[PDB]
Design a protein around this nucleic acid. Structure first.
Ligand SMILES: CN(C)S(=O)(=O)c1cc(O)c(O)c2c1CN(Cc1ccc(F)c(Cl)c1)C2=O
Ligand SMILES: CN(C)S(=O)(=O)c1cc(O)c(O)c2c1CN(Cc1ccc(F)c(Cl)c1)C2=O
Ligand SMILES: [Mg+2]
Ligand SMILES: [Mg+2]
Ligand SMILES: [Mg+2]
Ligand SMILES: [Mg+2]
Ligand SMILES: [Mg+2]
Ligand SMILES: [Mg+2]
Ligand SMILES: [Zn+2]
Ligand SMILES: [Zn+2]
Lengths: 184, 368, 368, 184
DNA sequence: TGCGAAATTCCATGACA
DNA sequence: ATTGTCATGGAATTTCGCA
DNA sequence: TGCGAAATTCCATGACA
DNA sequence: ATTGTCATGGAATTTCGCA
């Protein structure tokens, strides 16, 4: 059986609703299974249409053999199925209520949620502008299990943005204060 | 003047005037019987005026000016006097064409890694498509991998927006561009400094310097044209298609596609290569590192038989960028301060500024 | 299809499939273990579709298309199938560039006599000068002697007016011009028939054919520019000056001025040649007739290493004159009816018309 | 002493007033002494200004060493003298009341007057348009004395307009009738 | 151990406003 | 302070299949 | 019957919208 | 049914002046 490779499988999911930012409410999260490389796309809704529009950008750079997702409405529509079929992409669903991916992907998704939460407090409305820096951060984060970052596994070179300060990701006393205040 | 010509008439030898000829007086003028006929020898003090009158009839070069003079006059080394005047006619210097070709092109090394160097440029204006008129084209130097962005104008602001999207993936060490307004603004300079990106600019009016991306612009337009044959030119929706198609097209000389050079493995696109199916990713990446270092690199071609290469101190003239109707194509002479490489120089320009300039936009000033 | 591939699996030799390789079945497909790896051998009836899919990804040429196919498939003589499809892709045929140069230029004989052949053309629009915007340039083929007329438009009517003035001196056998609107009108055709003058037209979009006058246009503009340096571009009053200056300028290769070639003696202009002062007019005219017949004539230069010359029956494509943005640069293929000379042909065009066309505006259709 | 040549001497004179034709009233006549070649220029007046304007056209094709004329006002002005001086042209005047040129020139001028008179009767107003054909006719007229036409002597070749019918130049019965009627 | 044909490599040509 | 490039399809050259 | 310098010829380069 | 051209200034080559 053949070793795992980039583009074998993309894991997709929505995060949100988030506070409005340049009119956007959600983030479509795409994580390559083998490398852990993350791509993020702002959408106004978790619809099939927003997903197709966002994945059309990604799939004009690289096409996965398989897309894995939960049974969200956007992903189980006959339109989304037609879209995947047109591109020779197999669709793969976790069973309802039992979301499952891989350790690496789960950990990566956890990182994404935590990094997002941390950077939105103080500026819950400015995340649109921060999405690039977030992805670079995620994609230049060292993998304990594999000896390499997603960038290194995807491109086979070091990056020009090493993120040397592997960070807290934890909310400080101040940030918990204003995060418990923002939900008042 | 008279001294020289006096000694001559009384048969004493003056250097430059061959002794075997008979120099006489007639009608108040010194004359000489030469093979082609009788000519007047004007006094030295008259010669510059004569050369100038002959030259000025039609601002002729060496031979055509000489031929006029030789109709009436003979004196020693006439061409030396003609050339002296050619070298001082401002009007000739700035209007005449060059007859020396530039020295052979450089083939700079392929950037060693993906993201070492981006080349960027605008294509357009194109027929309006969804309100868009231009394409930002971004080409990775090492790989050839290319990103396309539709824009409404070739502005800094649309460049920044597109590159914020692109640099989500990775930040390049260097971005090379021409001197389009989009790229030379202080807003774009700040945008790049903020990110640790070095901006590198082409010499002015020399698109060959952005050749990496210019050449991709050709393929982009060629494929768009093919896909639009017999349909209206709704190009906006084909950009993604063209981007993917070109990024997965083989270069016959390399035997790789840009996608392969960037990722070392094909994604799920038609006719995906499968040779490394049994390698681990690390083995694959290791083969990729090898493939990257041994790509064909072309070499500097032979000089043409009459090229010139610039020398520190040389007088040279810069081509006028957009010369008005009936105006000279060349600026006044200027001096080569520094030879950056055999094809690129700093000159002390037509005002008083340092300018870094392609040799293709220079001619060597004629007649020293 | 299946027949061929069936016989193959049971180990019987089919021409084209080398016997030394092991052909098997797997996953429902015929396969072969080849040096570069295992490939699928599709049935013959499937191959055209495959070639077409691979080609259509980015409308690639021979090698880049083959390289895609070879990723998954092997069959005998794949390139022959690729080329077959290349030769039928309309979109490729009309959009791709040529990679064959035209054959070496002809150097037609200098017209034997003054007034045998005029070459005429317009220069402009120029900056307005006394309400004038253009110059009619008339160049005598044998002599190079040139007449200049300022006009308000490049119209038939202004051409006729100027030529009525010029032909006061002499009527030419032939007037050669390009296909400017001024020259191709029925009014101009009548004007010339009325006078016994034959009109000869350049192939379309090929100014080299009017090279005699185009080359004079260069000298005219160059001298005007020089005389206007640092002054406003009031060119109207300099036309007479430029006309006289150029008509009395030596061609270094000929050693004569156009005036001399026309008249055999200089008029009262500066530096007038005086060599025939002691000849009678008849002796002078006799020397002139000799001078005229022995002028330098250049010869057809060497072909470039990859030129093509047209052959009756060949498929060739005419360049699109003013191609729209994102539209092909070439017309659909057409056939060479007649080879007028190695650089000029009649073709049966993209509608159904005969067209006489320069080889510089043609490419040979690729892939036969 | 050196043989006579084209451009040695131009003989100039005015003819007119003539009936208006495209606004023009006079013809400036220029005849090259050696060849007999004629050039004609329509003017609105026999002024220095019209002469300079007309000779500026001619002298942008060829410059004579000498211009010969009678003592007409146009030719004896200090302006016309300045013009000639600027171009290195010597001016030459016949003594008043004694016009003299050369046999060839006198004969040529006679031909010009006669040809003009003949062609204007019937169409006294259409001569402007006929000036080209008149010059070609004159310049391709065989010279009894020299064995050649002016065209042949000027260019050293035959012309493409030989004027084979060396013509009457005499006014017919009809033309005398309408020429004596036009001055009524 | 050499042949005829196919496959691969060479490379001039031309277009990137 | 920077610097040409590379798809294309015939032709030239090399390799392949077989003996 | 040869030398050094001048004169002449060669010719690639580039521009004629 | 038509077709490149030729001024330009360094370099290559020839000729000139003298012996
Ligand atoms: C036409 N100008 C305004 S420009 O200053 O010259 C200019 C400015 C730009 O920003 C460009 O992108 C381009 C150009 C010219 N050009 C076409 C071209 C021509 C010849 C070549 F060798 C190459 Cl490589 C490309 C460009 O693509
Ligand atoms: C630009 N066009 C409209 S055109 O059809 O080509 C056209 C039409 C005309 O009537 C012209 O006089 C000229 C042109 C183009 N051109 C400049 C040019 C370019 C390359 C050369 F080799 C030569 Cl020789 C001359 C002309 O002088
Ligand atoms: Mg979900
Ligand atoms: Mg640009
Ligand atoms: Mg460009
Ligand atoms: Mg024209
Ligand atoms: Mg022209
Ligand atoms: Mg008079
Ligand atoms: Zn000058
Ligand atoms: Zn195609």
């Amino acid at each position: 059986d053949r070793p795992q490779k980039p583009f074998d499988k993309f894991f997709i999911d929505y995060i949100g609703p988030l506070p409005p930012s340049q009119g956007y409410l959600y983030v479509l999260v795409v994580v390559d299974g083998m490398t852990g490389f993350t791509w993020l796309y702002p959408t106004k809704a978790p619809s099939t249409s927003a997903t197709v529009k966002s994945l059309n950008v990604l799939t004009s750079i690289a096409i996965p053999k398989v897309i894995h997702s939960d049974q969200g409405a956007a992903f189980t529509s006959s339109t989304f199925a037609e879209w995947a079929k047109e591109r020779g992409i197999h669709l793969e669903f976790s069973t309802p209520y039992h979301p499952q991916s891989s350790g690496k992907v789960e950990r990566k998704n956890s990182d994404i949620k935590r990094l997002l939460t941390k950077l939105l407090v103080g500026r819950p409305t400015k995340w649109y502008d921060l999405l690039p820096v977030v992805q670079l951060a995620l994609n230049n984060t060292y993998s304990p299990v594999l000896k390499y970052t997603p960038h290194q596994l995807l491109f086979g070179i070091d990056s020009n943005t090493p993120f040397a300060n592997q960070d807290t990701l934890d909310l400080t006393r101040e940030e918990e204060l204003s995060l418990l205040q923002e939900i008042r | 003047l008279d001294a020289e010509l006096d000694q001559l008439l009384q048969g004493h030898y003056i250097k430059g005037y061959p002794k075997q000829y008979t120099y006489f007086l007639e009608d108040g003028k010194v004359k000489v019987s030469r093979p082609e006929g009788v000519k007047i020898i004007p006094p030295q003090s008259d010669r510059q005026k004569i050369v100038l009158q002959a030259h000025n009839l039609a601002h002729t070069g060496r031979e055509a000016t000489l031929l006029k003079i030789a109709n009436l006059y003979w004196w020693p080394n006439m061409r030396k006097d003609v050339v002296k005047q050619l070298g001082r006619c401002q009007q000739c210097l700035i209007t005449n064409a060059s007859n020396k070709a530039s020295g052979p092109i450089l083939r700079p090394d392929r950037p060693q890694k993906p993201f070492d160097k981006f080349f960027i440029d605008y294509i357009g204006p194109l027929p309006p498509s969804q309100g868009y008129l231009y394409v930002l084209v971004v080409v990775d130097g090492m790989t050839g991998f290319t990103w396309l962005y539709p824009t409404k104008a070739p502005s800094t602001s649309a460049t920044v927006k597109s590159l914020n999207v692109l640099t989500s993936i990775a930040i390049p060490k260097v971005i090379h561009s021409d001197q389009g307004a989009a790229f030379t603004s202080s807003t774009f300079a700040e945008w790049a400094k903020e990110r640790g990106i070095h901006l590198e600019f082409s010499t002015p009016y020399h698109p060959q310097s952005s050749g990496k991306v210019e050449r991709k612009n050709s393929d982009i337009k060629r494929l768009l044209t093919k896909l639009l044959v017999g349909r209206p030119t709704k190009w906006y929706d084909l950009l993604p298609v063209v981007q993917l198609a070109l990024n997965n097209t083989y270069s016959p000389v390399l035997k790789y596609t840009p996608h392969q050079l960037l990722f070392g493995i094909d994604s799920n696109t038609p006719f995906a290569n499968q040779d490394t199916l049994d390698l681990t990713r690390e083995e694959e990446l290791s083969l990729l590192q090898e493939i990257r270092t041994s790509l064909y690199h072309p070499s500097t071609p032979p000089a043409s038989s009459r090229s010139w290469s610039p020398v520190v101190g040389q007088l040279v003239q810069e081509r006028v960028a957009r010369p008005a109707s009936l105006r000279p194509r060349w600026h006044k002479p200027s001096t080569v301060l520094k030879v950056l490489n055999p094809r690129t120089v700093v000159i002390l320009d037509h005002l008083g500024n340092n300018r870094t300039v392609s040799i293709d936009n220079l001619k060597p000033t004629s007649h020293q």
